[PDB]
Amino acid sequence: PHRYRPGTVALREIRRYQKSTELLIRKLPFQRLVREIAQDFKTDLRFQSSAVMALQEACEAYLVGLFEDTNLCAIHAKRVTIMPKDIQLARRIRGERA
Amino acid sequence: PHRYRPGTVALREIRRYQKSTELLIRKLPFQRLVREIAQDFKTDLRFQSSAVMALQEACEAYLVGLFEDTNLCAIHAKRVTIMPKDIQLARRIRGER
Amino acid sequence: VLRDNIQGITKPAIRRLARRGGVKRISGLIYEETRGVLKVFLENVIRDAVTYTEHAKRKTVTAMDVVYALKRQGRTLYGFGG
Amino acid sequence: KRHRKVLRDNIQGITKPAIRRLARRGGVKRISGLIYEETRGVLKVFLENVIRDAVTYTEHAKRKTVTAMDVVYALKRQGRTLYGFGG
Amino acid sequence: RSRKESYSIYVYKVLKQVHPDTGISSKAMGIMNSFVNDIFERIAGEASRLAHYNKRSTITSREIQTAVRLLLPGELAKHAVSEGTKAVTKYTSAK
Amino acid sequence: RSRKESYSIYVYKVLKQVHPDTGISSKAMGIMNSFVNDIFERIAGEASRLAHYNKRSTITSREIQTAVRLLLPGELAKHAVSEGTKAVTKYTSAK
Amino acid sequence: AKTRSSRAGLQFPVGRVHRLLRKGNYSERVGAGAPVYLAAVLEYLTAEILELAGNAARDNKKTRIIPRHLQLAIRNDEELNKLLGRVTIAQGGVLPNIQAVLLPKK
Amino acid sequence: AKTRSSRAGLQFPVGRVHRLLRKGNYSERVGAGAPVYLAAVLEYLTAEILELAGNAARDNKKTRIIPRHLQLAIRNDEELNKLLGRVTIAQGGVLPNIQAVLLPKK
DNA sequence: ATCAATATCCACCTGCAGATACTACCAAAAGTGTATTTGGAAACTGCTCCATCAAAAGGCATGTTCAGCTGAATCAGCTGAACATGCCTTTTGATGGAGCAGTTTCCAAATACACTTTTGGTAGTATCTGCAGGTGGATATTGAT
DNA sequence: ATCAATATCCACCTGCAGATACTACCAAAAGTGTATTTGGAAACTGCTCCATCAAAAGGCATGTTCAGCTGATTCAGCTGAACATGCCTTTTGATGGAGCAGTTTCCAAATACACTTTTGGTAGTATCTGCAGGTGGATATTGAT
Ligand SMILES: [Mg+2]
């Protein structure tokens, strides 16, 4: 019964997803979220297909970048595990918050 | 003979300089530095005195802010002593590097 | 079996993003925290896009509306016009 | 003209106490000894960047005198808008 | 000697309306002047970009308003918009 | 129906001058378009500002040059000012 | 002769705002109500900053608003703080704020 | 009838650029040189980028440049990375980069 | 806790810089009033392309197991804070000289503007092919023993 | 170490989603001929800006001492990685119709232009007042005991 050690798949997945450029959130759920959020600003709205793909590209690109920074924050604190506080510190310093 | 313990004057200084607004670098040195650097870009420049003051207001505000971020990075690593790597991490996440 | 739209952003998806991010190991509270962050991002962008839409007296949000909303939020995006 | 004293190593006029005072206004309680040189490096870069841009405005106006406005415009370009000196 | 204008006067009137017993230093006034010139440019800029995006050659109060909404945060926006609209309605009906 | 203007074309010529045996995807060309528009807006706007700062009413090649210097990094700014200067000379030296 | 300001019931100068909209190359044409709206918007923001700055002057037992009072007002108000998040107010200093872990004892 | 582009030695369109300058409200008037200069700067940068993109498709055994190639070419060039530091390249992914401390020891 | 050192606080008090106050001149706005031009809202509708949905697709929720990471605790070493001492360098405030921003007045050169050719560049249409996946088998990496 | 489990790389194949190629208008560049506009080239000011000298404090440099912080070390417990799959949500592809986008129309609203009137800026003098910086002196704060 074979079994990879904790970390070994993770690294494998890093090497994999850094190599590729496909989106990583599933479309329909991202799309429904967009509409939920937009409903709160104006009702009965329609979205060009490419207007939703633009959003998805932007978010994914944002979050991946935030995760790079977040990861540097965990590493600064001598950890290798990213916690919320790391995400909060990165946003704080980016000027997105606080 | 009397001694405040390590940190106790540090906290006093923070409260003091957070309460005031005067420039914290001496004027004449700052001005020489501004003239050195510009001279290396273009010789025979003159400066309106308010140009130099603007530069100084702007540098001090930039460093004070960077020291705040630097401090947050030290505290995040469970320290209270800011180190170069703290300045470095703040600058990277700011996009300065 | 009902569910919050935001929870449509699944733990495995979030993890993938982090892996593109170079992250090796993830606390379990990140997923909720990430969802929060992502929501505020879309709120801010969408609010500004929709604002462009209403200015144009349209009922469709266009790629350009988004692009312009991105631009001014300092998240300039290449590849969708503009 | 006749002479004009050479400027060298003026970055050192950004002394340790001055730096410590900036850090206190930034809330910092304890400071590693290496911070002083690191801060001088960071400061020099920020000044070079702003001055480079201001002087470019000066040269473009064909003046020999850097103004507050020249500085103010450089600051804004660089996302450090400054109030209090015009513009 | 050339006329260098500023918003010093307007600022001082508004100050007297909100704090009739309160003065302002010329440094502080310089700051206020910077503030108004800054917000002026930011709004005017957004409106310009806006008109252009919509192939209009004209910046009307409608473009100012959308700019305001793009630029200001929540409650500042809401209030700015009402004072704006109020000033226009009144102006329009006062010739 | 109506015309949608782009640079997708000048880009293709430059591609052929630079890598004659290499093609480009639709998306890729979309990016290159955004790129050209972006840099165009950055340089124009900065040029616009210079001209206004100096109370001039005209955007000459000198305003473009200065802009390029303010906007581009070291070497990039520099191979670029030469190219731009070269084009002006050649366009001038051309009956 | 009524100023367009009094017509609109503003302290801020509508004519001047109109002129600046022209000379700033923002568009071919400027609608008659743009400067009215804009001058009103600026007037409102300045009223708003002055209110909080005044308060900050009175809190420090002062009659005269200095740059520190603008800075205290702006930075203690969420929305002004955001609107002016990338701006430096000369002679403003910073808000008194020490991180808890730095305080003595436990 | 000779295109100003061919006079200038350029592929990019001096005329179009002249026009975009007139109608983007940048200034009351526009020099004759200004659009030539600008067009040439745009062509130059386009070139430099296509050049490096080119090489990156070549390196990946491909003849058709895709957004990815543009990302590898920009983020591996110090100066283009700086110029485009606040820009997202759709469908670009990110550079292979793992922090050394995360690599397995043994 | 109690005691002594010293930092802190606050409140009153005179010199004075920076603020407010006129005064008055005026030059540049801003406003007023026709004469003239047009941008863009309004209304009508053609035709993309967007919402909706049925069948086909394949990613994710789940619960268990324990590897190894995180956070707590202890501690030796040495770094950085506090502080006294000696004195250099900045600050402050004069004085002169001039290098240079800031104007004004006249044109030659440059750029806008109205009008007509003459294409270069686009949409719509027609061929052409790079490579995204598929398979097969060799090879590399990981982990157990 | 060797050995099996499993991931990864590499060579080759091939249909078609997506390039490139071609055609044929035509909006918008280019060419032409006047109609403004502008950015200096000279020719002067009055500044700010630079230099420099002298006095004086106010802060800087330095060395010593040791409090307490940092980083090393050790370790137990908790918490996230790895794991197999059918249930179910997402993906795909086919079809009405919403509304974006094309087009035309026309007047409320814009620019333009030449007067008329006003206000906001400055500069000359004049007065004033808030508060910076100094003074004890009554109230904490800290740290040694
Ligand atoms: Mg030098």
Author numbering:
A (entry chain A): 38 to 135
B (entry chain E): 38 to 134
C (entry chain B): 21 to 102
D (entry chain F): 16 to 102
E (entry chain D), F (entry chain H): 28 to 122
G (entry chain C), H (entry chain G): 14 to 119
Paper text:
Histone proteins package eukaryotic DNA into chromatin, yielding a structural hierarchy, in which nucleosomes comprise the basic repeating units. Each nucleosome consists of a core region, composed of ~146 bp wrapped around a histone octamer, which comprises two copies each of four different core histone proteins. The H3–H4 histone tetramer organizes largely the central DNA of the nucleosome core, while the two H2A–H2B histone dimers organize the outer DNA regions.
We generated two distinct classes of binuclears with either rigid 1,2-diphenylethylenediamide linkers, yielding three stereochemically distinct species (RR, SS, RS), or flexible methylene or polyethylene glycol amide linkers. To assess the nucleosome site selectivity of the binuclear agents, we carried out X-ray structural characterization of nucleosome core particle (NCP) crystals incubated with each of the compounds. For all of the chlorido agents, substantial adduct formation is observed first at the RU1 site, entailing bifunctional coordination of the ruthenium cation by the E61 and E64 side chains of H2A. For the RR, SS, C2, C10 and PEG agents, high occupancy of the RU1 site is proceeded by substantial adduct generation at the RU2 site, entailing bifunctional coordination of the ruthenium cation by the E102 and H106 side chains of H2B. On the other hand, for the three compounds with rigid linkers—RR, SS and RS—there is electron density between the two RAPTA groups, consistent with the linker moiety. For the RR and SS isomers, the two RAPTA groups are positioned side by side on one face of the diphenyl linker, whereas for the RS isomer, the RAPTA groups are situated instead on opposing faces of the diphenyl linker. This differential configuration allows the RR and SS agents to form bridging adducts at the RU1 and RU2 sites, thereby cross-linking the H2A and H2B histones. In this regard, modelling of the C2 structure shows that even the shortest linker would allow RU1-RU2 cross-linking. It is therefore likely that the majority of adducts in the crystal structures for C2, C10, PEG, RR and SS are bridging RU1-RU2 cross-links, and the lack of clarity in the connecting electron density a consequence of linker flexibility. Moreover, the most potent compounds tested, C10 and RR, are roughly as cytotoxic as the classic DNA cross-linking drug, cisplatin. Nonetheless in the solution state, where nucleosomal interactions are dynamic, even the shortest binuclear agents, RR and C2, are effective at cross-linking nucleosomes.
